[PDB]
Structure formats: C-alpha cells, structure tokens
mmCIF file of N, CA and C in Angstrom:
data_model
loop_
_atom_site.group_PDB
_atom_site.id
_atom_site.type_symbol
_atom_site.label_atom_id
_atom_site.label_comp_id
_atom_site.label_asym_id
_atom_site.label_seq_id
_atom_site.Cartn_x
_atom_site.Cartn_y
_atom_site.Cartn_z
ATOM 1 N N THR A 6 44.780 -6.097 51.329
ATOM 2 C CA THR A 6 45.211 -6.954 50.147
ATOM 3 C C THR A 6 46.558 -7.453 50.404
ATOM 4 N N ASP A 7 46.872 -8.737 50.013
ATOM 5 C CA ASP A 7 48.163 -9.336 50.181
ATOM 6 C C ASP A 7 49.274 -8.589 49.502
ATOM 7 N N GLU A 8 49.113 -7.987 48.348
ATOM 8 C CA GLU A 8 50.020 -7.262 47.593
ATOM 9 C C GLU A 8 50.554 -6.015 48.304
ATOM 10 N N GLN A 9 49.687 -5.350 48.962
ATOM 11 C CA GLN A 9 50.005 -4.159 49.845
ATOM 12 C C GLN A 9 50.854 -4.590 51.029
ATOM 13 N N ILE A 10 50.555 -5.669 51.679
ATOM 14 C CA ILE A 10 51.356 -6.304 52.781
ATOM 15 C C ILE A 10 52.761 -6.647 52.325
ATOM 16 N N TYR A 11 52.928 -7.254 51.174
ATOM 17 C CA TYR A 11 54.148 -7.693 50.588
ATOM 18 C C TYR A 11 55.073 -6.443 50.261
ATOM 19 N N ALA A 12 54.479 -5.376 49.646
ATOM 20 C CA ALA A 12 55.142 -4.181 49.294
ATOM 21 C C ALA A 12 55.590 -3.512 50.549
ATOM 22 N N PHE A 13 54.889 -3.490 51.660
ATOM 23 C CA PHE A 13 55.218 -2.879 52.915
ATOM 24 C C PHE A 13 56.481 -3.567 53.499
ATOM 25 N N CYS A 14 56.533 -4.882 53.467
ATOM 26 C CA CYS A 14 57.581 -5.599 54.115
ATOM 27 C C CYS A 14 58.775 -5.711 53.133
ATOM 28 N N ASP A 15 58.635 -5.368 51.894
ATOM 29 C CA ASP A 15 59.708 -5.199 50.936
ATOM 30 C C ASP A 15 60.519 -3.931 51.292
ATOM 31 N N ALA A 16 59.807 -2.891 51.793
ATOM 32 C CA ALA A 16 60.454 -1.696 52.242
ATOM 33 C C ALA A 16 60.976 -1.823 53.573
ATOM 34 N N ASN A 17 60.456 -2.736 54.456
ATOM 35 C CA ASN A 17 60.750 -2.810 55.852
ATOM 36 C C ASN A 17 61.121 -4.267 56.170
ATOM 37 N N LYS A 18 62.172 -4.743 55.574
ATOM 38 C CA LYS A 18 62.516 -6.172 55.647
ATOM 39 C C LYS A 18 62.967 -6.623 57.077
ATOM 40 N N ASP A 19 63.656 -5.719 57.792
ATOM 41 C CA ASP A 19 64.329 -6.052 58.988
ATOM 42 C C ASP A 19 63.433 -5.713 60.204
ATOM 43 N N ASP A 20 62.197 -5.237 59.972
ATOM 44 C CA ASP A 20 61.176 -5.167 61.008
ATOM 45 C C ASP A 20 60.774 -6.624 61.421
ATOM 46 N N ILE A 21 60.537 -6.763 62.708
ATOM 47 C CA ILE A 21 60.278 -8.026 63.393
ATOM 48 C C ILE A 21 58.936 -8.664 62.754
ATOM 49 N N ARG A 22 57.958 -7.768 62.445
ATOM 50 C CA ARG A 22 56.759 -8.212 61.891
ATOM 51 C C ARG A 22 56.800 -8.757 60.525
ATOM 52 N N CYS A 23 57.817 -8.295 59.790
ATOM 53 C CA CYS A 23 58.134 -8.678 58.431
ATOM 54 C C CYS A 23 59.189 -9.793 58.293
ATOM 55 N N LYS A 24 59.421 -10.540 59.346
ATOM 56 C CA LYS A 24 60.359 -11.617 59.327
ATOM 57 C C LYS A 24 59.682 -12.896 58.987
ATOM 58 N N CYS A 25 58.409 -12.864 58.654
ATOM 59 C CA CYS A 25 57.626 -13.980 58.154
ATOM 60 C C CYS A 25 57.476 -13.854 56.729
ATOM 61 N N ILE A 26 57.999 -12.833 56.092
ATOM 62 C CA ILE A 26 58.094 -12.620 54.636
ATOM 63 C C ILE A 26 59.519 -12.820 54.324
ATOM 64 N N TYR A 27 60.406 -12.403 55.156
ATOM 65 C CA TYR A 27 61.855 -12.478 55.004
ATOM 66 C C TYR A 27 62.510 -13.069 56.227
ATOM 67 N N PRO A 28 62.611 -14.369 56.262
ATOM 68 C CA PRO A 28 63.286 -15.060 57.402
ATOM 69 C C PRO A 28 64.778 -15.138 57.155
ATOM 70 N N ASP A 29 65.564 -15.116 58.222
ATOM 71 C CA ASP A 29 66.969 -15.326 58.264
ATOM 72 C C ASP A 29 67.319 -16.743 57.706
ATOM 73 N N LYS A 30 68.517 -16.793 57.120
ATOM 74 C CA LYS A 30 68.893 -17.909 56.289
ATOM 75 C C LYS A 30 69.003 -19.251 57.106
ATOM 76 N N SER A 31 69.419 -19.184 58.259
ATOM 77 C CA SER A 31 69.492 -20.233 59.222
ATOM 78 C C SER A 31 68.209 -20.966 59.466
ATOM 79 N N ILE A 32 67.093 -20.137 59.631
ATOM 80 C CA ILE A 32 65.755 -20.543 59.827
ATOM 81 C C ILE A 32 65.176 -21.339 58.679
ATOM 82 N N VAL A 33 65.524 -20.904 57.486
ATOM 83 C CA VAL A 33 65.149 -21.522 56.192
ATOM 84 C C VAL A 33 65.716 -22.909 56.103
ATOM 85 N N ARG A 34 67.031 -23.093 56.365
ATOM 86 C CA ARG A 34 67.709 -24.326 56.425
ATOM 87 C C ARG A 34 67.185 -25.303 57.383
ATOM 88 N N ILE A 35 66.856 -24.845 58.646
ATOM 89 C CA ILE A 35 66.289 -25.629 59.687
ATOM 90 C C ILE A 35 64.939 -26.184 59.284
ATOM 91 N N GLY A 36 64.169 -25.357 58.566
ATOM 92 C CA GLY A 36 62.872 -25.745 58.110
ATOM 93 C C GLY A 36 62.875 -26.834 57.090
ATOM 94 N N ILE A 37 63.871 -26.754 56.169
ATOM 95 C CA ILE A 37 64.146 -27.689 55.125
ATOM 96 C C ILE A 37 64.561 -29.076 55.752
ATOM 97 N N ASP A 38 65.368 -29.007 56.714
ATOM 98 C CA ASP A 38 66.018 -30.213 57.394
ATOM 99 C C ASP A 38 65.015 -30.880 58.324
ATOM 100 N N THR A 39 63.988 -30.152 58.826
ATOM 101 C CA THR A 39 63.051 -30.672 59.730
ATOM 102 C C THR A 39 61.848 -31.095 58.990
ATOM 103 N N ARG A 40 61.750 -30.738 57.716
ATOM 104 C CA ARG A 40 60.692 -30.987 56.759
ATOM 105 C C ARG A 40 59.334 -30.381 57.178
ATOM 106 N N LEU A 41 59.428 -29.119 57.678
ATOM 107 C CA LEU A 41 58.266 -28.387 58.065
ATOM 108 C C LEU A 41 58.626 -26.934 57.732
ATOM 109 N N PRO A 42 57.891 -26.192 56.935
ATOM 110 C CA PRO A 42 58.139 -24.798 56.518
ATOM 111 C C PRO A 42 58.260 -23.839 57.758
ATOM 112 N N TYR A 43 59.085 -22.802 57.631
ATOM 113 C CA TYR A 43 59.439 -21.835 58.667
ATOM 114 C C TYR A 43 58.293 -21.233 59.373
ATOM 115 N N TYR A 44 57.245 -20.858 58.587
ATOM 116 C CA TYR A 44 56.061 -20.116 59.082
ATOM 117 C C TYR A 44 55.159 -20.887 60.023
ATOM 118 N N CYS A 45 55.374 -22.228 60.077
ATOM 119 C CA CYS A 45 54.534 -23.094 60.876
ATOM 120 C C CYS A 45 55.022 -23.047 62.329
ATOM 121 N N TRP A 46 56.298 -22.721 62.575
ATOM 122 C CA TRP A 46 56.863 -22.861 63.919
ATOM 123 C C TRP A 46 57.600 -21.577 64.392
ATOM 124 N N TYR A 47 58.070 -20.728 63.552
ATOM 125 C CA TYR A 47 58.836 -19.547 63.844
ATOM 126 C C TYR A 47 58.113 -18.570 64.649
ATOM 127 N N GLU A 48 58.676 -18.028 65.743
ATOM 128 C CA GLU A 48 58.185 -17.225 66.804
ATOM 129 C C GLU A 48 57.487 -15.895 66.290
ATOM 130 N N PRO A 49 58.098 -15.082 65.396
ATOM 131 C CA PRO A 49 57.453 -13.864 64.943
ATOM 132 C C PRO A 49 56.251 -14.105 64.104
ATOM 133 N N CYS A 50 55.906 -15.337 63.699
ATOM 134 C CA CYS A 50 54.792 -15.649 62.802
ATOM 135 C C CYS A 50 53.695 -16.279 63.650
ATOM 136 N N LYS A 51 53.903 -16.399 65.040
ATOM 137 C CA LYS A 51 52.983 -16.699 66.003
ATOM 138 C C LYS A 51 52.558 -15.510 66.791
ATOM 139 N N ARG A 52 53.180 -14.368 66.549
ATOM 140 C CA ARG A 52 52.820 -13.102 67.051
ATOM 141 C C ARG A 52 51.508 -12.649 66.543
ATOM 142 N N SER A 53 50.746 -11.855 67.263
ATOM 143 C CA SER A 53 49.369 -11.406 66.900
ATOM 144 C C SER A 53 49.438 -10.014 66.264
ATOM 145 N N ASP A 54 50.652 -9.466 66.119
ATOM 146 C CA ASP A 54 50.929 -8.184 65.465
ATOM 147 C C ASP A 54 51.643 -8.426 64.151
ATOM 148 N N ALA A 55 51.860 -9.739 63.817
ATOM 149 C CA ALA A 55 52.560 -10.119 62.650
ATOM 150 C C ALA A 55 51.857 -9.774 61.385
ATOM 151 N N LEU A 56 52.606 -9.442 60.344
ATOM 152 C CA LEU A 56 52.020 -8.998 59.048
ATOM 153 C C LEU A 56 52.035 -10.246 58.166
ATOM 154 N N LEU A 57 50.858 -10.858 58.041
ATOM 155 C CA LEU A 57 50.685 -12.173 57.330
ATOM 156 C C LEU A 57 49.647 -11.908 56.269
ATOM 157 N N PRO A 58 50.016 -12.059 54.977
ATOM 158 C CA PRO A 58 49.077 -12.197 53.894
ATOM 159 C C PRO A 58 48.086 -13.309 54.108
ATOM 160 N N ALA A 59 46.886 -13.217 53.437
ATOM 161 C CA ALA A 59 45.800 -14.252 53.405
ATOM 162 C C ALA A 59 46.294 -15.491 52.773
ATOM 163 N N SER A 60 47.123 -15.353 51.689
ATOM 164 C CA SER A 60 47.804 -16.431 50.915
ATOM 165 C C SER A 60 48.762 -17.200 51.822
ATOM 166 N N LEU A 61 49.567 -16.496 52.595
ATOM 167 C CA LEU A 61 50.459 -17.061 53.567
ATOM 168 C C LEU A 61 49.748 -17.848 54.698
ATOM 169 N N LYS A 62 48.640 -17.227 55.174
ATOM 170 C CA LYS A 62 47.781 -17.802 56.192
ATOM 171 C C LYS A 62 47.183 -19.113 55.780
ATOM 172 N N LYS A 63 46.737 -19.275 54.530
ATOM 173 C CA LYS A 63 46.305 -20.460 53.920
ATOM 174 C C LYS A 63 47.408 -21.501 53.901
ATOM 175 N N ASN A 64 48.655 -21.176 53.519
ATOM 176 C CA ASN A 64 49.812 -21.998 53.538
ATOM 177 C C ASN A 64 50.181 -22.541 54.825
ATOM 178 N N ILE A 65 50.041 -21.779 55.928
ATOM 179 C CA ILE A 65 50.250 -22.203 57.341
ATOM 180 C C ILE A 65 49.208 -23.275 57.675
ATOM 181 N N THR A 66 48.048 -23.187 57.148
ATOM 182 C CA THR A 66 46.928 -24.087 57.456
ATOM 183 C C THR A 66 47.180 -25.367 56.658
ATOM 184 N N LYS A 67 47.962 -25.342 55.532
ATOM 185 C CA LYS A 67 48.173 -26.398 54.650
ATOM 186 C C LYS A 67 49.499 -27.134 54.972
ATOM 187 N N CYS A 68 50.250 -26.734 56.027
ATOM 188 C CA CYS A 68 51.395 -27.475 56.525
ATOM 189 C C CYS A 68 50.910 -28.184 57.702
ATOM 190 N N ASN A 69 49.643 -28.077 58.080
ATOM 191 C CA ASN A 69 48.928 -28.768 59.082
ATOM 192 C C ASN A 69 49.478 -28.755 60.490
ATOM 193 N N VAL A 70 49.913 -27.542 60.878
ATOM 194 C CA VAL A 70 50.395 -27.298 62.206
ATOM 195 C C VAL A 70 49.222 -27.088 63.131
ATOM 196 N N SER A 71 49.289 -27.561 64.366
ATOM 197 C CA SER A 71 48.193 -27.660 65.289
ATOM 198 C C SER A 71 48.160 -26.515 66.270
ATOM 199 N N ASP A 72 49.041 -25.448 66.008
ATOM 200 C CA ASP A 72 49.176 -24.359 66.822
ATOM 201 C C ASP A 72 49.091 -23.152 65.856
#
C-alpha cells in the first residue's frame, strides 16, 4: 500500500531509495524551470530498487516521459 511506503520514507528520508519522495531542493527548482517534474528524470527514481508508490507511478506515466 502507498501509505506504508510513504510512512517508511518519512522515517528514512535520507535513504537513496526515498529520494523520490524527498528530493533535494536544487532538483525541485530544476524541474520547475525545465517544466518537467523531478520524478520523470531524476536518477534514483529510475532505479529498480526505488521505493515508488502506485500513485507516484501513475504520475510518472502522466508526465509522459518515454523512459
């Protein structure tokens, strides 16, 4: 469940796998300025061990990234 994943990364913010729930401030600004959300391009969110909610996964599909 997405709620469980969120709770886990709330406790473990600075874990690499939880940087798709809590990205560094520079990344957020870059995403705004490039007009594409951070999760569409950021490297820890293209990892296969990444902790990604189903809701977040849908959002990635809805920014229409081809990778």
